[model samples]
Target chain A: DMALQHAVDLLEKMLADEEKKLTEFNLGDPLFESPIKTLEEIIQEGDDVVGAHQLVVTQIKLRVQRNRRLADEIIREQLTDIRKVFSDKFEKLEQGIQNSYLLLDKLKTPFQDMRCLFEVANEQFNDTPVPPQYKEKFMVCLKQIVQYAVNSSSKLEKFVMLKIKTKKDDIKDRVTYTCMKYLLMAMQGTGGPKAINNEEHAKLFFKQLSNYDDLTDANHDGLELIKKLDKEQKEVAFHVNNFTHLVTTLGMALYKEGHQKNDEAMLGMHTPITMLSDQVRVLILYLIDEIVHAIHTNSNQSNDELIDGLKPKVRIVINEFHATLMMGIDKMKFYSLNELREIVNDKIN
Target chain B: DMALQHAVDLLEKMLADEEKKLTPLFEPIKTLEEIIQEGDDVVGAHQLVVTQIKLRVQRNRRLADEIIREQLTDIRKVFSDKFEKLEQGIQNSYLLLDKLKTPFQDMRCLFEVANEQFNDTPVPPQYKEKFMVCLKQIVQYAVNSSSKLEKFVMLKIKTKKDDIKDRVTYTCMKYLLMAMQGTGGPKAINNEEHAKLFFKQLSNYDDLTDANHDGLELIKKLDKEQKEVAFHVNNFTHLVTTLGMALYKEGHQKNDEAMLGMHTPITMLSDQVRVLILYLIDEIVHAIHTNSNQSNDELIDGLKPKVRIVINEFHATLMMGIDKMKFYSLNELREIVNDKI
Candidate 1:
C-alpha cells in the first residue's frame, strides 16, 4: 500500500511537469502569440528539429509493438483458457462415460441372470417348458441391453468428433492467425515505408544513380563530375611575369597554400588562369559549404567547427591556385605537400 | 495501349471462373418449380444429396490441404527473394567499392611528383627551379583531385548507409509481411490456411503457456493432449460403464418416440461399451484399425449412420464391460475369470 501510494504521488508530479514541458520545443507563450505567428514559427522550428518527425514515428512504432505484444499475450491467455475449458469438459465427459460403464457392469450380471433363467427350460422333473411370457421377457431384457450399449457408443462418437475435433481445429486456425499478426507487427520496422505518388520520382532517380561504379563502366554524370574536377585541378598550373611570379608565388601562395604553378609568360599567355580557376573553385566551394552548413545546422547539433574549417581549405586552395598559376610560385616553397608526400613514401617504404 | 489491353484481358480471364462460381453459390434461382414446393424440400428429395454434402466437406479438406501447400510455396518464395536480393546487393556493392578506389591512385602519384620537385633543392638545380614551379602547380592540382575523390567516397558512404541500408531492411520487412499475410484472405479455407492459422495462434498461445518456448514448444501441447488421452484410455473400464448407462437409458428414452427420435434404438450399448473397455486390455487394437473394411468406413459422414455406428462401438464396449464384469450374453456367453479350483 505504501509503495502504491508513493507511485501515485510520483505520477502526479510527473504529470504536472509533463504538462509544462509539452511545448518546450515550440517558441513563444501560447496565450500571447498570434495564431498565425505561432503556426509559422512552429513550422519553421519543426523543420530545424531534425528528429521531430522521427520521434513521432518512433513513438507510434513503439505503441504498435506494445499493442501487438499485448494482443499476442491475450491470444495466449485465451488459448490457455480454452485448454482449461476443454480439459474440464473432457474430464467431465470421460467421467460420465466411465460411470455409465460402471453402472452397466452392476446391471450386467443381474441382467444375464434374468436372461439365463428365463431362456432355460427346467429339467428337474418332467422336463418342464419355460413359460412363453418369461422367454419373451428374456428377449426383451437382452434387446434392452443391446440398445443401451449402442446408444452409449453413439454418445461417445458424438462427444469425440464434435467437441474434441472441432475445438482442436478452431484453436488451430485462431492460433495461426494470431501468430502471423503479431509476428508481422513485430517485424514491421525492418522495411522502409511503402511507395507513394511523390516517391516515384525520387525512387526512380535513385534506382538509376545509386548503382554508380565510377572507374570502369562509364556513367556520363559521374564522368562529368570527375572531368570537371580534373579540369579545375589542372587549371591550377598557371603562370605570370618572371620575378614578380618568383616573389609572390615563392612567399605568399607557395608558402601559405602548398603549391604554385609555373610561369606561363613564355607560352604567350600574359597571365595564368590559376587565380581565376582558384576564384571559381573557391566560389564553387563557398556554394557547396553554404548548402552543407545550412543542412548541417538544420539537421545536426555537433561538428560545427569541422564544417567551418572547409571555408579555410577553400581559401587556401584558391590562394594556392593563384600563386601556382598566376604568379608562378615554385613548388619548393609549399611545405605542406612535401611533408604529405614524404610521409606517404615513408609508409610505403 | 496494347500492353494494358492485354493485362485487362488476362485479369478478366483469371477472375472469370471464380466470379461465375461465386454468383451461383450466393444467389440461387427462386422461380417457382412445377414439381418442387420449397427449396429445402427439393434438396431433401434429391437421393444423392446427403452423400454430396459430406463429400463436399471432405473435398474441401483436400483442397484446403493443397492450398496450404501453395501457401508454403509462397512463403518459401518470399525467403528466396529476400535472400537473393540482399546477397546480390552485397556482391554489387563490394565490386563498386573496389572500382571507386582507382582514381585515388592517380592523384597520389601527382602529389608524389610535386613532392619530388619541391624537395629537389640541391640536385641538378637546373630544371629544379622550373621544376619547383611545375611541382607547386601539381600539388595544388593534387589537392583538388583529393577533395573530389573524397567527395565520391563520402557520397558512396552516405548513400550506402542511408539508401541501401534502408532499402534492404525495408525489402526484408516487406517480404516478411507478405509471407505472413496468409493465403486467399479470411474467407478462403484450405489446409494451408488452417495450418498457418493454427501454427500462428499456437505460436502466440505457446508464448503464454511456456513463456520462453514460443511457437516452437507447441509440440509440447500435443504431448499434453496425447498424455491426457492415454490417461483417459487407461481408465477405459470407467468409460465403458459411463457410456453404457448413458446410451441404454438414452435408447429406452428415445425408443418411445419412434418417429421423433428417428426410430434409433440402443440395443448394442452393452456390447459397444464392452468393446471400448477391451481397448484398455490391448491399446494396440484401440489405436490402429487393422480391419480394412472397418477402417474404410467414413470417420464422420451421414449423421444417422455415423451416430448409429459409433453407438454400436459403445455397445460393443459395453459388452466387453459385461464380460469384464463376469457377465455373459446368450450369443457369446463363454468366458473364464478369477480361477477358483
Candidate 2:
C-alpha cells in the first residue's frame, strides 16, 4: 500500500513536469501556463487530479496540433514566395546566357571571312616583279588594304571579346600573317624574282610564325634565319616601316577571342538551387518527425475517445506536411531525396 | 579729124566686146571712097555706140560694189552670232566652275580629315581599301570633268586667235598635270590643317616651267610622286571626287540642251570651260607655288593667304560680263590671257 502511494506521488510529479513543458511548448500563450491547470484546480476540490489530467491533456494536445498546422501553413506560404524569387532569377540568367551565345555565333562569320581573306592574300602576294616603279608603292597599297581589313576585324573582335570574354587565337594568327611583313616577305622569297612553281610553297612559307613554340627546339636557330630572311625580303619589297600597328590589332583580336570562350563556359554551370532545396528538405523531415512522434506516443492514452478523436487531426497535419514536402521536392527537382521519403514513410507505416 | 574718128571707133569696139582686140584707131571703117555716099549716117552710128557702151560699164561697176557689200554683211552677221554663243558658253562655264569650287573646298576638308584619321589607326587595311576605291573613282571623275572642260575650251579656241588657241592647249595640259597627281603627294607629309590647305602649294611645286612643254616633260616624275603620295594618302579622304560628281550632276541638271546643234556646242563649251577652269586653278596653283616652298612650313603658311587673294581675284574676273565689249571676262580668263599675251 505504501509503495502504491509512492507510485501515485511520483506519477503526479511527472504529470506536473509534463504540464510545465506543455505550457512552455504553447507558443500561442501570452504567459507560461497549462490550460489544464484551471481544470486541475476545479477537480482538486471535487475528485482526483489524475482523472482531470486526462481531459486537460487531450485538450492541450489538440491545441498544440492546431497551432502546429497554422504555423506550417504560414511557413509554406513563405517558402513559396522564396521559391518564386529563385525561379525568376534563374529564368532571367538562363535567357541572358542564351542571348549571349547567339551573339557569339553571329560574330563567327566576320571572323571567318577575315581568316579566308588573310590566307588568300598571303598565298597570292608572293612571286609576283612588282615593277621597280611600283615595288614601293605597290607594297604600301597592299599594306594599306591588309591593315584596313585587319583593323576593322580587330574592332569587331574587341567588341565580341568584351561581350563573351574568349580569346580567338586562330583569327589573330591569320590576321598577323596576312597583314604583317610575313606576307610581304614570303612574296619576296629568296634570290631575284624567280617564277613560283607551287603557290602552296608560298602559303607554307607565310603560315603564321608569330608563336615561338611553332618553331622546333633546333629551329631556335631557324628563327634567327627567318628574321634575317624577313629583313632581306623586306628590302626587296622596299618595305621599311616597323609593324607596330599590325601587332596591336592582332593582339586585340586574340585577347577578345579568349574572353568569349571563357565567359561561355562559366555560364554553363548549374544554378545554385541544389543546396537551397536540400536545406528545405532537411527542415521538412525534422517537422515530420516531431509530428509523427507526437501522434505515435499518445495512441494508447486512457482517454481513448479523446485521443482517438485527436488522432485524425494529427494524421491530417502529418499528411498535409508530407504532401507539401513532396510537392516542394518536386518543384525543386530534388529527385535524390529517397532518405526523406523513407523517414516520412516509416511514420505512415 | 581722122585721128579723132579712129579714137572713137577703138573706144566703141573695145566696149562692144571687151575681150576682142581693139581695132587700130587709124584703121578707117571701110574706105574713104564709100564715105562720101553715107558719111553723116556712119559717123552718127559710131558716136551712138560709144555713148551706150560708156553707160553700161558704169552700171556694171556699181552692181559689183553692191554684191560685195551683201557678202560682207552676211559674213559679219555669222561672226557676230558665233561670238555671242562663245561668250554665252564661257559665261555659263564660269558660273558652273564657281559653283563647283565650293564643293571642292568642302571635299578638300573631308579628304584632309580622312588622311588625318588614316594616320592614326593601326589596322588600316579596310580603311585603305575604302579610300583606294574612292580615290580611283575620284580620279575617274576628275578626268571626266576635265575632259568636259577641255572640250568647252576647244570650242572657244576655234573663235579665238591662233596664239590664244595654242595658249589654251598649253594651259589645259598644265592644269591636267597639276590637278591630277600633283596635289596628292605633298599634302601627305604632315598632320595639321597647315599641311592640307596648302596642297595647292604642292600643285605649284610640281608645275613644269618648261617652254616647249607638251605638259609631259615633268609628268613622268609627277606621276611617280602621285603614286607614292597616293599610296601614303588615305583613299577614303578623297571626297573631292564625289563633290566633283555632284557638281557635274548639278551642271547637267541645268543643261537641258536637246537641240543637238546648240547642244553640241554648249556641251563642248562646258567641257572646255571645265578644262579651262582646271587650268585657272592651275594658275591659282602657280600663284600659290610662286609664294610657297615645297619643303618649308612658313612659306607654305604664307602661301594660303596669297591663294585666298588669288582665288578672290579669280572669282572677280570670272564673274565679269561682256559689258566692256571685250568679251565676258573673268579672273580666270584674265590670268590665262595674261600668260598667253
Candidate 3:
C-alpha cells in the first residue's frame, strides 16, 4: 500500500542530514538552528503509527464473529506497541521545550524507542509479502528515530536543566544547528529499503520510473513508493519545527536533576556560546536574505534598504568584531558581545 | 460500563473548558487555538461518539434477528437523539479552530489547538446518570482550570515567540484569559439520565440537598450533586492556570489586530516588551522558586543560591529602570505606569 510511502520519505530526508550535524557536534562546534528537521523525521514516523492504527480499524471491520472479540485486544496490543514509542517521547517532548541545548544532547543518544516498535507494527500489521531484509532495515530506522527522540529529548532537557541548574553563562551560543540537525541525522534509517521481491522493492525505488525490479503490475511500481518517501522526507522537515517549543519545554521538565555537568574543563562553555552567536547571526541573516529575495522576486522595488538592513546587520557586527576584540584585550572582558546578549536572559532578569 | 465512565471522565477532563475558549474576534485570541481546542473537544467528544459507533457494531452483530434489529433501532432512535445533543460540540470544535481571526490575519494556530485537543481527549467519557453528576462537577473544575491555565501558557509561549515576532506582547497576553473566564470556556451538555432527573429535582426542592427528588432515586439527592460541583469548584485553584491556558489561547488570536497591537506602537512597544520581560521573569521565578522548594524540602540545600542570583538579577533591572527612563527623559511617564503598573 502507498500508505507507507509518506513515512518512508520522511526517513530518507532524515538520513540525508546525518553527517553534517554529527560532524559539527563531534567537533564541538556550537549549533543552533531550530530542530525542525529532526522533529519532522520523528513526527513523520507517525505516518506508520497512523498506518498501524488504521490497520487495526480495518482488521476489526473485517473480523465479524469470534474474531470480533479480537478487536479490543488487538487494538490494545497495537496501541500499546505504538504507545511504547510515544509514551517515552510524550514526557520528553515536554522537556524539549524547557531547553533546546539539552535536546541536542538527548538526540545524540536514544530514548523514545518508537522506531523499533513501528517497524514491528508495520511488519505484523500488513498482509503484503514479508520482505525479511526490508523488515530488518525498517527496524534499524525505527530504532534510530526512537533512539534519537529519546536521546535528543533528554539532551535538550539536560541543556535546559543545566542552564537553570548550573552556575555558568547562558550556553545559547554553544548550540550550532537547531534541534533539527540531530533529528535529521537520526532519521536516515538505513538508507533505501533493503531489496526484497520485485513487487515489494518496486514500492520504494521509484527513482527508476521503471525500476530494475521489473514489476508485472504497470500501475504500482515499487520505486514510486520510494520516490514518494523522498518527497515525504522534505515535508517532514517542513512541518516539525513550527511548534517545537511546546515539545522542548515539555521534554526539559522530564529530566529532573538528571544527567551530569558539562566540564568547561574540556573547553570553556562560553567559548562555544560565542561561536554559536556568530553562527546564528550568519545563518539567520542568510535565511532572511534568501527569504527577502523570494519575497521581492516579483516586486518592482529592489528592497535595497530592506536587504541592506538585513545584510548590514551582520556586516556591522563583523566589522565591529575587531574593535570588540581590541576592547576585550584592554578591559579583560568583552563588552559588545555581552551587551548584545542581554535580551533573552540578562535583560529578562 | 466503567470503561465508558473512564472514557467520559477523560472526555470531560479533555473538554471541560472548551466553551470558555470560544470568544469571537473581539477578544485577542486566534481562530487556530479555537480550531485546535475544537478539534480536541471533537476528539474527546468521540469518546461518546464511540457509543454510536458501538451501537452500529452491536446492530451489525445482531443483524440476523430482524426482531432484535427493530428493538435495536428503537433504542438507537432514542439514543441517537441524546447522542446528537452530546455531540453537537464535536462538529463545531474544529470549525471553531479554523474560523478567521479577523477579516485579515492567516497564520494557522496549530500546536496550541492541537495540544489542547489532545489534552482534552483524556477527559472522562461516561454518559450515564451517576457519572453525569461527576461530569458536571468535572466540567466546573475544568472551567476553573481553564480560566487560569491559558494565562500560564500565553505567558510561556510569549516568552519564546517574541524571538520570531516581538510585538505580540499584549496580543499574546490577550489570548491568556479571554477564552476561559466566560461562558464560552465552561459549557456543559446535560445528557445523562440523572441530569434530566436532577432538573426535575431542581424544579421541586431547589436548594434542599437533604430532600430527595423522585426523578433521582439511586443518588442521595440532587443537592449532593450540587454540593459535589460546588466543592470541586472551590478546590480548583491549582487547575486554574492550566484550564485557563487550554481554553483561552484558542480564542485569543481572534482579537482585532489594531486593538491587540495597542501594546506594540513605537510609543507603547518598549514598555510592552518590558512587561513581557517581567512576564518571562515571573515564569522563571516560579520555576526557580519551585526548584528552591524542591532543593530545600527534598534535597535539603535550602533553595539554591542560583535562585537568589536569578531573582536578584531581575531586581537590579527593576532598580535600573528609573535611571534608563530618566536618561532618555521619556515623556510618557503616566503612560508607562498605566501600561505597566
Candidate 4:
C-alpha cells in the first residue's frame, strides 16, 4: 500500500516538472533569442525522455499483471488507480514531444540538400588543378555557398531550440546538431558529405574515357570542371580564370533580378543555367584545393600555412553570401539550394 | 480270238445272273450237316468253280495291280481322294457331335441323379421337345455306328485278319445294345419335381464355385484320389517285373530291351481312359434307347454301374497317369481335373 502511494507522489512531481519545462521552451520569451544549441540536440533529448517514460510504464504494467493474484483486493484497487493516472499523463507527454521532433526534422531537410549539392561539386573536381591566384577566388566562392545554406536554415533552428527542453527534447536537438555540421561542411569544403552522385558520374565517365589523356584535353566537356594537375600549370590558370568569370556572370544575373519578391524570383534567377554556372565555380574551387595540396605534398610548401592563409578570405565570402541568403530565407521561412545560388549571384554582381 | 470271245460271253451271262449269289466258302455249311439232300451237275460246277477261283486268285495277286496300273488307272486312283471325301463328311459330323458334348455333360448327371429318386413322374412338358430332339440324335449316331462296325468287319476280312471277326462282332453288339437302351431310356431331369431339386442344387453349386467359396470338398477329394493313384503307380514296378517274367516264360525275352519294352508308355493310361470314356458315353446313350419303357429309377440304376465304370477309370488314369508330375496349388489341380473331365 505504501509503495503504491510513493509511486503516485513521484509521478505527480514528474508531471509538474514536465509542464514547467514546456513553458520554458516557448519561443516568445526574450531568453529564447539565441538558443544555447541547435534543434537537433533538443530532438535527441526529447527522444531520450520519451524512451525513459515508456520503460517505466512498461515496467509498471508488467508488475501489475504479475501481481494480480498475489495482492490483496484493496491494495490491487489502489495499484490500478495509480496505473491509470500514470498511463494518461505519460501518453500525452509522448505525443507532445514526438510532435516537436517531427517539426524540427522538417526544418533540417533543406539544409541537408544544400550541403549535398556543394559536396557533389567538391568530389567531382577532387583531382583537378587550380592556379594559386584563382585558388583564393574559388575558396571565396565555396564559403559563400556554405554560408548561404546555414543562414537560410537558422530561423527554423532557432525556433526548434527555443521550443525544446528536457531529456526528451534533447533527442531532437542532437539531430539538429548533426544537420548543422553538414551545413558547415558545405561552406568549408572540408569534411563535406560523401558525394555519392558525383562518384556515380565519375564511374560512368571514367569507364568511357579510360584514356587519362582525353580528360586533359582542352575541348573535352564531359568533366571539363576537373582541371588536370600536370606540371604545366597553365591549364590550372585557364580553369581558374573561366571559373571566376562564370561566378561573376551568375552574381550579376541574380543582382539584376533582385527587385522581384515572387516565389520563383525570390531565389533570384535560380534557373538550370544559373545552377550549372554556380556548380562549375564550386567545382573549380575544389580544383584549387587539390592543386595546393598537391604542391604541398610533392614540393616544399607548408600545407598548413597555405590553407590557413585562405581561411580568413573564405570566412569573409561566407558572411557576405549568408547576409544575402538570409534576406530571402526570412521571407520564405525555409532554406533551399536555389536561395543559396541567388545569394552567390547577387554577391558577385 | 475264239477263247477271248468265250470268256467275254461267260462274263456277260454271269453278270446277268448275278441275282443268284454263290455263298463264299470258309467253313462247313450248316445246311448240309444231315446230308439228306442229294447234289446234281457236280461235273459242270467243278469246272466253272475252278475257273472262277482262278480269276479271283489272280485278282488278289499281281494281275489286279497290272490291270489297275496299265488300263484302269482312272478307276484305281489313290485312296487319299476317297479318304479326303470321307474326312470332309466326318469332320462336319464331328463338329455337330462336339456341339452336343457340353450340353450333355451338364444335363446327363442331373438326369441320372434326379431320375434315381423320382420313378413315378412322367416326362415334363417343358423337356419333351428337347428330349425328342436328343432321341433323334441318338438314332442318327446308332446308324452311324452300325455302318462303321460293318466297314471295320469288312476291312478285317479283306486284310486276311479273319481271327478278329468274333472280337469285332462282340464289341459292335455291346455298342448297339447300349445305344438302343440309352435312346429309349428315361431322362431323369424330365421329371418335374426331382428336376427342380436337381436344378436348385446345380445352381447353388455354380454360384458357390463362382464366389470362390466352394470346391474345397472337391479339391480334398482330388487330393485323396491322387494319393491313392500314387500308390497304384508305385505298385506298377512289381507289375512290370511280373510282366517281364511272363514275357521270359513265353520265350519272348531279349534281355534289357525286352524289359524296357514291357514298361508302359507314359500316355498309355490317359489314352486308355479317353477311349473308355468315349465308349461309356456311347453306352449310356444306347442304354437309354433300349430301356424306353423302363421306369426312371430302373434306367438310372442301369446307368449307375456304367457311369461308375467311366468315373472310376477316369480318376484312376488321369490321377496316376502323370506319374509324379507336380501339381502345386488348388488352381493347378483344378486345371488337371477340368482337363480330364
What RMSD, rounded to one decimal, does every model reach? 51.5, 58.0, 41.9, 69.8
Candidate closer to the true structure by TM-score (higher is better), 1 or 2: 1
Off by over 4 Å in 2: A1-53, A69-73, A100-163, A166-349, B1-341
Q: Candidate 1 residues A231-292, lDDT tens each?
A: 32333223112222333322232111110011111111111112222233223323232323
True contacts kept of 4: 0.00
| Model 3 per-residue lDDT tens digits across residues B1-341 | 22113323333442334423322677221222232344355434323332332333333223323323332233323323323332333233223322322211211122222222222111112212322232333233323323222333233334333321222233233222221221111111112222322333333332332222122222222223333443433333323333333222222222221222222222122232233222222222233324433431232122233223322333344333331121111113223333432
lDDT, each prediction: 0.30, 0.32, 0.29, 0.32
lDDT of 4 by residue, A60-150 (tens): 3233222222222322333333334333433433444355545445534433434544564454333222333344544554454344433
Can you rank all candidates by lDDT, best first? 2, 4, 1, 3
Model 3 residue A324 lDDT score: 44
DockQ of 4: 0.00
- Per-model TM-score, in order, reads 0.19, 0.16, 0.16, 0.15
DockQ of each: 0.01, 0.00, 0.01, 0.00
State the weakest 10-residue window (summed lDDT) of model 1 chain B.
B256-265
Better of 2 and 3 by lDDT: 2
Least lDDT summed over 10 consecutive residues: which range in candidate 3 chain A? A257-266
lDDT of 3 by residue, A212-269 (tens): 2222222222223333333444444333332243234323322221211122111223
Superior by lDDT: candidate 1 or candidate 4: 4
Model 1 in CAPRI terms: which quality? incorrect
Interface RMSD of 4: 72.0
